[model samples]
Target chain A: MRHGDISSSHDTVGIAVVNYKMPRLHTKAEVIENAKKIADMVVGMKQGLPGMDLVVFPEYSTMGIMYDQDEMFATAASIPGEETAIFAEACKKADTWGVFSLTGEKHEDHPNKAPYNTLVLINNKGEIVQKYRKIIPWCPIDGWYPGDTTYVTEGPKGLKISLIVCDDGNYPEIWRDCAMKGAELIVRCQGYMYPAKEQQIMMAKAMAWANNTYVAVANATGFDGVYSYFGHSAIIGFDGRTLGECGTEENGIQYAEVSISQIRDFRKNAQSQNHLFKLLHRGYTGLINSGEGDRGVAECPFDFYRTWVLDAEKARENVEKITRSTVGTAECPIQGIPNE
Target chain B: MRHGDISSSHDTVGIAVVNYKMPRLHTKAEVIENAKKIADMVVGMKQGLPGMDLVVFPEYSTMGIMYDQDEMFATAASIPGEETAIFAEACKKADTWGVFSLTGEKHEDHPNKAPYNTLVLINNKGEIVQKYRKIIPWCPIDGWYPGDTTYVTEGPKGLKISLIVCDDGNYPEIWRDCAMKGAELIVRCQGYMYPAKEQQIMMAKAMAWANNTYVAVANATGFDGVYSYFGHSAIIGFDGRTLGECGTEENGIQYAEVSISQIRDFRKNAQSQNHLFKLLHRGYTGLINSGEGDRGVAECPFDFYRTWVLDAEKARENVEKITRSTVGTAECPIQGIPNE
Candidate 1:
């Protein structure tokens, strides 16, 4: 009798994944047609899909990145421009939300004077929801600014969804802030260049354990110019488990059936939330918030060991010196001896 | 004939040291007397001291640290200010070049604001030769600002002389530039916060290794507020060998006779400058400078490993994709499978 309505009116969340491949040398019209074809492929799969909740594409899914060395910066455009209008209308007709990545032009108002690698979210109503800029640009791209705002907004069943891109995974604070603000699911778009699939998978597991939320990460695969991208798209459960993953593959789909109910249950049942981070909020006296604080809001572990040890010794010595002075000795208890 | 002239003048270079300690409350006069006493002690030490050429003192050597709360900043004076005049005259009377640190309040025209940590070099004639401001700050006492210029100068027989406070040792680049500029010797005035003693010692060793230059570090020792300084000042050779170091309890005058001639001999005979930094400048060159262009440096083990395993596979895959795409079926040539 005490069991509240636990029935999931929606049983399964179907997902249509566009395994976009590299395009052959084609004209601009062919590029637009390719995007439409990708959309058509999703619509064709929709006949069998049930209760579709989200769709995602790999990073740089936009019209193939142009790098002909003729000053690429002078020829970039916004996804909202006439080019991206095609993808927007498709999301509305399909009656589903779409998550995709594209190269964005630097707007006059934008802080960065250079081109941006951005992730755009289009809702079922065909309205642009959020656009998160990639942070932690690998070498030669640090000019690309990392996002300053921690965005978390409503989604299906009151779910708060957010995003992080590529190298942002190196720093866990970005994830912790989203989880703290009740982000139930996070979608990370990646274009990884390193051969670190194991590390990526392990990091996903750790973020899940630290934040108690569902995380979905997607990466680009294949060669671009002299560089290559490794794909290890993954989904992690709140209990720090890999629910789904698409191992390094150029064309593949990794599906996950994550339950917000399970995440809530784990948060309630866990002890000390996984303990390395002791969250002591300033001016508030309460029990410690236990968790690996790696993805927890306030605990930043950049040289944690050094800071802790140094601060502790400094405090102890200060007390000892006072005590020695009260007892009155002209000599120091810790005097320095000159070497021979 | 060229090597003979260089080798003959090697033994004349030696170092002079003026150890400084913060004066206890009513023990100010005793601390001043102790400073002079230690200066005399350096002259007495017989380890090649007869050929000594330069000397240095710890930061805030006069009247100790004015931790009387409010009086700290006010106590710091200018270069030829009251406190330095006494130390200046002492250096001249002793007929030796001495570098002493003094807390100063420079005029606004000076690069930084008030309360600068300045170091003064007094020649044998009691004339101030060079002066520098401490770039890194330890606590708020001196209000140190990172100076636009590095504290280094070419001395007799190409002996590169430089100065830095204890806190500056942690920054590798500062010392690295000194070494690359052909500095044969590096003299630093250090004050430790006990807990950081180990890191400080390791830094002196690393600076010697990274730039292939001799390093001489002198640390301050005493109990102040919440910090207990650990004095373990020592002189290191160009080949990264330790010449002399003082123990924590023995704060009396300590000296060492350094031979500048051994640097050339060591470089000519050693396989890697005796302490060459094995790691090549990777990120700096690849990011700051165009790869394979000017500012291009040699590659290291990590680069070779990345090239062998990562780059080689990427190259093979590039060609494989072209062939497969031509046939209309493409695949990820390199996909990592778990548990393989």
Candidate 2:
């Protein structure tokens, strides 16, 4: 539900979240109508939790997963396409910014280019502000295209937010990248099933604590025939405390207050406890006096960065062997038919 | 209370921990005798747990905190001194390795090398096998000397363990350094009062999860006059799950069994989910194709490593200025007398 809210100045931000249980998409029209329903929910939610500035929808909000490429390609929309215009208008009508994630086809690139699990941020004035293709797509199992870079953008009311998807949370470097890029809040979209739900909560709170930022997480919850998702979505403070969270129910939405200045001040005042600052000044302690100035791997006593990479070569081969056939359609004997 | 045990070969190692509510030390003889009690506990505990290979003591187990310099120097013992012999003999009798911590005077270095908070590891044969001076010595309030390097040592049954104390847990880089140095288990000693108790549990678990290692933590408890410590001491598995823990009391001891083979197999088999393995191979999944190969700060999009080090100049100066007076006392007129 989109909490109808205004940016109460720059110190605090009001955020709303919407989670849904969507089954596999059969047609583009079905997904388009789903986008309209989410927009309607955004407008509808404002009446309940008023004074909300930003609303975040979970991953797979529009384009749900499937084994069949025909159902996937037929439903997945490109950025600036017919389905996305609804979110922009919804953001404008609700007088709030929003983050909506879906599967996007690179039909413009090539029919065979594969699809991207994507996050799009829209401004209050109905403008599509930013887009981020999931960098670390759930690999081997997920044949989706991966983004080459991780980037952050300035959202409404001076909130510097970075958009990331489910798999991105596993890698701490991605969060650090967003933090280093001046992101004060990181918005994550996921619809995880069992096992990873724990990892999601842990990683979200951890990324916030380690990076000295606020994290607003939106998780989808429902039974989509093959798998059941356990949505434990929440807002985490910079200190790794849970701000707000949802239960194990389908179609859930939550919201929380984020004080940007409190986060900024701590990172400013704290010495070592503020880890984002500590990574740079790591050598400042006796490590520098001892001549171990974190000078990358060359001087590393363990030499694991170099040695472990060599060890991972075989593991890297495993990724390629699994994903090589999955990336391009040429390997699929019956292109449009389900291999499973 | 030392958990009585023997190392059950290379696969499992028994570890015992002891925690006590020790107050300010006023004499060296008191600390010397305290060491004997700890050794006795090691021999005593084996009747309970039976297979313990090692014992870990809290930070201020012997040389508790104090404001007076006279009380400190009078009680603190230098390594290899008369007081150090008790633990060696204890290990000989108990037939178990031990991690004992206390304040150490570098009497050999100088009357006032100030003092070092130290960890001494004695082998089952009663040999003074390894000594690690706490590197990031509690700082400002601690007024103890810092060590120059982070090191890992081979322990019983082919186990590689790294020893660090209190403040060292605050920095991820320090843990990474030890992890890089091939530490399969990290034994940390701390008598954290409050507030930081949460950080302690979080860091210990997160450190194990990120580095792919086991963690044995021993913490002190009860009222030490000025402060009361909450002994939330625990042993964390490599997967970041709590193995065992203690309650809030005057004294506490706990034991846990660690499987070297189980930990080793996961690190060997898993890909990105195994974080220690993932950190090195981060570039393989499209970030390399994007030309941002984690090339260490120079190429960082935020360039905060360089730019941030510049911003942290003052905050870092706060560390030096606060710690400057605490380390190597020269300003006080009476060299060996109490200032507070």
Candidate 3:
């Protein structure tokens, strides 16, 4: 049985995973309208579901991600301005924390002209705390930038939270980074498709189990013009159990109660199958050695086979070039202005 | 459909996961008797089945693993002698590769006189190619020593193979090590029980999918005095599909054909979710950088958080001390283990 099923008085944080059935916005005006709609929905849900501590929305909630290359460029807006201000205002009134996904326009002097598929974390006081870019891009046939690193921060109720985008969860190292940095809950936001549902969900549960953290997946649903999204968003517990889930082709909400105490207890006390703490003990012969000479604490075996090392000087030069497959031409396109 | 089910011609390695209904042996005589029985079974099957390239057995196949500390130490045998000799001899005629699990005695005057739960891999020509000790123990109620590292060797049909025992499969790093070292197939032998069935199976599939390898799991079944083993052995494909599977309470065999060409094709040509080759690209700014300094190929981000560094001197001293909870004493009763 899950901790949520019990009637205990443990301090629990409520998470709301909203599978939004976002409409395909064809024009810039439509994108701005949906932004306001999404913001109001969140504020209303916070008022309706009083127990919810954090409200998480799927990727590209402000603008439909199916926009063509030229449309994506012209429709993109500043992070704290056009697309995010309405949610900020709504957050201030509802006094609820939230994670909103948007297509963010880069600064004028930035190297790459491509917009970023970003997750903006806003506090209950309406202040934007984090703007993490999607490190792993989906269908790079479009224009978007990949972030450089994984990050974790102190969240409401003193929980350590890490934010990652859709395709990012496929890599085990990212999850390890989150866990090693003391992330108690890893929130993965997705605007993904159907075929990858099994791999996506399986990875969520396995990442939670192996990394010893709660994994909350928030996925988008319904047809967005060209492609359709599968919404099997879920909340996987520390023990690899599914606390709550949504159905395929459905627009709904999945709520899971997370307890930091339970997670810490398992990480510290469990004798067998405790992978997180044991990371430091692999091949550590000292725990049983008597006459060992040089078998000391070793580096990760990955280093033993890492032949393709990326250099920093090379990194410096690469970021300055725009590597998008296709650039937005000066053809007639969509335009955006004003706060939602 | 799995590549195993296809009728097309390709170089494939046939794997048999025998869910052995290993009888619980209580005496040294019974252990020897079963050792011969197991040897004959492998020889007959290899000749009869014809398609079988590799035959994998469950852990502690020679003697039942439920033995106490005294019985365990008394009955332990050399890896290539006594217990493994019969199979080695049988393998000569059968000309088949095999992985056998046994309780092995340490070299005389060794620091920890405790026996090691070991996996001995025999080549088609009946030579003991590798003897790897179980890094993680089951109950720790008895005497067993852990091996220091993971090993991979050239096996039948020129395939690179890696071997690991029961509890070691729970750690993702071990699986990664096998994959990073170019292991086409990871054969895991287990004498595991009922409670971890879900995790056991889930991890097997996830490991195969993420690591991009064929995973063949051979599990023991039926009650062994105290713990009842769950015998749902399986062979999972690189695409995370179950090629073949056995039942929980049944003694059976699961057959799967693994194609090295297919695995390499997927690892190289696949456009999306190519986690294997993409490891070197994680957070590397060079792939897109323009300006230069020290953004060269960086080490794993894990170094950023690793604070517990074990030294060589401590490891040397730890190995010298006998850490087994209980040791064989003169007051005990178990007798000599001879060549089967």
Candidate 4:
């Protein structure tokens, strides 16, 4: 369901609060409280409105993907944890689905350790539906491990959805895999500065085209004193076209209607699927299952040895010959000579 | 010490010959006869005496780098074999150093069946002083195996001379290596073509600039019907400037002085050695020395695992999540929104 008006929507659809600008203590809680307050203030949202179903917040809404692990862990909560339980219950009362970012912790297994920059899904029943941890973490994001598992779940009105964290969408595999898994709805959450916004939007749109699925990306808007988030949150159709989008200052949802029949139609008769999918699939029976990956060729066990060795031999031979003839003379045989 | 010009004035000099097409079934005697005709032309060059010090002949002057193994074995000769001795005797009688291309079968271990496309250096005394093999073999030339060793010898007037066969000049490392080995004069022997002339000459100029060496390239001209050799022989100065270049149709000696002292001055006093030499020297030491080089980057041990494999993992996860969620709603939060 639509979460925002097409005309005069809020100045900002999402606010990606930058990490650790001021005092570390209570900064995230303060930011989260402010973001929720702003979300609550957004106007003209109705409960169970026909065709209107979902709303999303930006990545690191509760706490940013920051360097200070201890502070993040201190702010991180579980699915039905105190702070998240309130948000989930609110969505149920409102009869709408909510997608929000959180710092999620599994403190017992990885005690007092760094937390996952997670996006959680809460349905109308006040139930926590999906939790996808950030994948393809950016520079220095290797500190927080990627969610080893992947998932998608049913939401309101026969919609199946998946989530991708920032940096994960830039890579083709994550979104493509989700599309292959039959995800009808894809949500990407990002928290990046102005210079990176255009690239992020392009990536999201490309993902929609490649997968033939609906894409809704929410980016952080506004500034954290030093860094400004270039907000142009957007939704892309399964056909790789822009369906809905928000400006840098839109602190509310952008609305769009995605047709299930459209997704079905493409899936049933997809021209690109062959080139995109079959291009990835094994060619012949011999080629697909072959184990040898040397020389970057050989898909078939039978073809593997010859392809690997022979091609490598040819390449090596060419390279060796190029090395040996290191010196030549400046003698033009045909120069100053008459040819009969 | 100069060859062609009897007078000791070394201002501007040029030398070249025509490499006519010989029948595929042409015998060694025919090849020697053609070589003698070119030598006779060098003798006739005495008429234009007190000019041009150096002159060069086309590739495959002794016989082309033919494809047929039987024809190759039949035609190829040893460097000190009958062919060079004849060329040497001619060089002495003519009193001009003759730079020539030959297909030589070196009896050096492991090369019994295969012969190399070699360049023979005939001094004015008619002594074979330096020799190098063709390093780059395009398409059909693969039948002629590569030479294993590489070297640069001394040139007349204390020039640190190196050699480059026709195609070998395209690869920068070949020249860089010679520069690294303290070469100042690069005499390139080639059977270069028309369309590739600009690229070849540009690279030669760049090499002279990058390595601070004089580059003199000689090419053959003749319509072999299968592939016409377009002659545009060139001579670049120590400052990488084109002092002279030849026309493709008219085969003639293109002359230039290529002051070695200019390179000496530039290397000693230029604002920078361009810093690239220093950077490559510092960073690419292992790759340069490892004997695993053809392309500059390929010779290095760089890994794309982090560049590609990691991203693939994320994409796979995304596809799985999207597909699984559509298959069954809410299987796992990380996978997709779980319904159960």
Candidate 5:
């Protein structure tokens, strides 16, 4: 949907979050076959929700169990390549917008590193509208290269949308950035397990409230080899109110209708309530964006264990330094994909 | 209370949130007399919760109903001035730390301008540990200058603490900055009324979760002509859980014991769950702290109506610019106090 084509009827935008178990696949063909199944499920989800405009699938729904670097390279396809084409076809069939998180070909300078953990956004017209690489990849566990930039675009029903992978939602700044860029809806796709369940769920609610935007999260169900996948997909509104939620043990679709008009009204009325934008306008610009000091680390993924194993003393010291520093990213730039 | 004096018995750092109804007073003497009443309340609150390490009061508790400029200037006092001396004496008597929000002298610069909307933190030793001027002052309602920097200092039971005023709590970056500077607890004091209640309450929870810090909020409960204060003071844990909350209609002390040890343990365990520190380490340095952009307007309070009356067209244009802008404080730097 183009931004200009938005009309009054598109007040409350409907979305369906698909929480499905990623099947264990042995070969590339098997992966592609599972992808087709997910496409079918998306079509079915749209049928159940009737006029649902957007359907979001959990991460690794396409390349589940491809933890091994070689296996990931073999199974994962390019974003606009075969895998996304299949998902786009389903969006066209359902006459709805969609989001799919999967492994994509290396778009950065690094050739030796694994593919980028990417989220593709497709509109109802089956056009690829936006793509976001997981800036903070779940490193070591998911051997994918980190993305440097964030992308925001228009979605169905006049919603300004942004896509984030599992770990990306952990950072409130990313959510804030998207909101700052005028995002009305943030869709999080995760292939997460039991340990992260409570944390991520609360984060979804917190992000929604903090950014005053709708947050819809779709997580994988059933167990992967190393961990037990906990679904519990949910959709939270701008007021930190839950619109809909799926169970941890279930594999199903959770539906919610987000009102863009309601969000605008609240933002207008809440001028007296809490002007976060004003605070951001005044405080943040000086503190983080101040073009002083050293540009810090470019990319530090959630891979503490790996760092510990690689060099315990350095890891412990670095961890302390990273967590304790008052300076932000501008000073400590996390290195991106390796140079050519 | 010093950090080394902390014992295992300090598992929970007990705090008494003194939610007092600021009685409207006619003169400066009456205001200072009412301030003494708050000091007594703090001591009484400490006696009720024996060994309570901290006692907090709502914003403008010292000088309520000082809406007129002359009245505000007459009633307002310095942090280390007579008002804080009274509060400090109570702190010393109770052997506890305390936070009090009031009008403070601009210790940084520009004595010619109005005083700062400030929160003062004093320790059991009767020493003022930190003074935080409100970065986001409630303009027409406040008529005070905004603060530039954030301050974090040690609290009882080896806890690192920070202070935020009413509207300052709206910005997550302020909370994030405090946390990054090693704040384990954040105390927010407000004399806010009806409109901002819901938004501020949710923002408190969100800030606690995002920053992984304990948040204690004390709000005034009573009327001051133009505004009817709403209490409902609360304390939220690092896990985004509300430990305790007081109702809106009454004025009383709300108690909650925050565990600094528990927060430390979680920060160590949840390294993978959501390490926002790492995200900040990777993404924020150059953007906000960059120091290149036009240092924007300072002291934008939530008084759109008042602004419209002063300059309708400029106010209208400014309001549109503020509400619609994607970038926050980075593009809209709040002007700082003039240097000598």
Candidate 6:
């Protein structure tokens, strides 16, 4: 139990987010070229910031968003293929961990009819550490299939990192899932439209504070025919404080320094319990799904659990029961001085 | 099924937050006198706003956050006791619903050894509709025991409302629980110290946006011996927009008009899935707790689920499997235009 000057073990890692316009790529070669542009930006960011060890780019960074099925199919490519290899080589040359999102080719053996909106993590050694598909697809327009499972990976310098793309960040559970799996740094990548900019900023800060983790959001700033992407990328600390931020139309790399030891210590000294962890570990098992009809194609979507709402009388009774049983219990209550 | 110009069914309700100083109260009579003061403010707010239907005050508004055990025991009173009766009478007189926090007397049959930091709701008819005890007690101070259960009650215009007291707002689960139980409006009452102001505002907005519900926060604005409370009271829309806010150290009621139909319409047209609801209804039962330790005395308080974090290689494999198995399967994928 040695808690030496705890700050001594603090690792100050610099995370850089690249906010850029989506490059129109009509050909596969064009897509790889776009990825190389991202690589160049990473190298530029590393040179500019000096100690930048990790760099992130927005979703659809490789292939510009394609609304038509034919266009999506034409642009999709296999991950670890040319686009990612370009990123890998760039990461190796710069000696930094990199995160980027693209339209991944459908898996052959378990071939789906839709391409995966995939995010990849490449280490300094030019190896693919992890690939996470967007679990909650931005439907009708994304032209990407929903991913069933999520991922948490260890990145350069042993940082516990996780990835959530664009619309996936809209769900609190995805962030909580990453946190439950030991995520200390959560990276969010989005090709957010002007209408989504407000929520993106709010949710990024919210997720960071809610999960007690640092968050780096990289959003695109360009047009995709139907909508204009307005970037307001940011790096938020564990306390929901914005360490660094980029405005709506800016296209450059913004940097922030984060300390793992500081976040760990902060959580340890937190006055409040991590209630999400407690409930998931205990009472969540008792929940029952009782509603009917398919609101959508997913699991228990819609107002499917309306039956669970507690009845008025029963809720009051439960409250009375919980409140009344207080006196002789061994349970430690907040103690007050005895009145003489 | 008729979905008329849905806006026609919209009911606009005015909610007021009283940002006031905690009055000194050494005796039971002083506490009731303080309740009368709160009632007077509610009546005043109603007169000023004309159509104001609901009013709220910060946590420990009745007791002034008694730090000493003897003082807390002396100040603690029953829910249907004089304090709430006074509030109910005020509500009836003003023809409005109200919410307020106080030090509640322990439940009789299962008497706990401490008073409950409870928030009670009173209808326009001068009756106690429901009571919720603070689940996450701020320990080492406050001189109150943690409540074991929570509650959500129907309020004005059939709006479903729930309460989160002070530190209870720190946990995401309590909010999620309230949402799951059909809460459309969530009220947060704080006896929080000045240092907690920023996190409080950010968290309130985040919770409202995350749950697609209206949020009203009422905070104390004065000193209570060991801590100085500053109010940053606000009314946040379901879209996370701040409709109204009060200045720090301000001692008056600020009002906001919220539309139930607007919240319902916004949620209906939400671009993302309700991930929390989906998880509770489907995926929660499979969770297994495997970690070991006695962190505190509560159900599953220990870090009992560390074994759940997936290894990098295995996580990648799972992702590939989920992405590949898309077509010709019982698992429904998002339908799209077929590739000819």
Best by TM-score: 3
lDDT per residue as tens, model 1, A1-340: 0111212235333333443454332345555676686567455444444445566776666545544322334434576764457667767667667777655445344422445667777787767787776643432322232233546666655556877766555434456556655577777777665554544555555555545567777776777664466677776666556666675677555655566555554443322232111121110110011111111122111121122223533322332221211211233221211111
Q: Please tell me what DockQ candidate 4 reaches.
A: 0.02
DockQ of candidate 6 against the true complex: 0.08
Error of 4 at B27 (Å): 0.7
Once model 3 is optimally superposed onto the true structure by TM-score, how far is the C-alpha of residue B168 displaced, in angstroms?
2.3
Error of 4 at A47 (Å): 41
TM-score of each: 0.41, 0.79, 0.82, 0.42, 0.77, 0.78
List, residue by residue over B26-103, the lDDT tens digit for candidate 3.
677777788898888887777656767788988866787745656765677776677788888777777778888886
User: Which is the better candidate, 3 or 5, if ranked by TM-score?
Assistant: 3
What tens-digit string does per-residue lDDT give for candidate 6 at A159-182? 789988887787676786677667
Clashes of 4: 62
lDDT of 6 by residue, B1-340 (tens): 0111112122877788878787667888888899998888777767666666788899878778665556766777877888888888889988889987877565342233556678888889988887887766553233354565667788888788988887777666567667756677899998778775777788888888777678999988887677788788888877777877787765856677777766655443333333332232121111110011111011111121212222323432332232221211223222220111
Better of 1 and 5 by DockQ: 5
Candidate 6 lDDT score at position B176: 65
Models ranked on TM-score: 3, 2, 6, 5, 4, 1
User: TM-score: which is higher, 1 or 3?
Assistant: 3
Classified by CAPRI criteria, candidate 5 counts as incorrect
How would you encode candidate 4's per-residue C-alpha lDDT over A81-108 as one tens digit per residue?
7556666656765666777776544433
TM-score of chain A of each: 0.71, 0.83, 0.83, 0.70, 0.79, 0.77
Give the lowest summed-lDDT range of ten residues in model 3 chain B. Answer: B320-329
The weakest ten consecutive residues by lDDT in model 2 chain B span B294-303
Across A1-340, the per-residue lDDT of candidate 2 in tens digits comes to 1122433445678887766776566677778888888889999887776667899988887777755666766766778877678898988888989999877555345445567778888999988887887766553345466665566778877778889887677656577667767787899887676655655666677667767778988888887776677887777787877777887677787787787667666655554465554443332333222343321111222232223333445434433332221222233333321222
For each candidate, what is chain B's TM-score?
Answer: 0.68, 0.83, 0.83, 0.72, 0.79, 0.77
Q: How far is B63's C-alpha from truth in model 6 (Å)?
A: 1.0
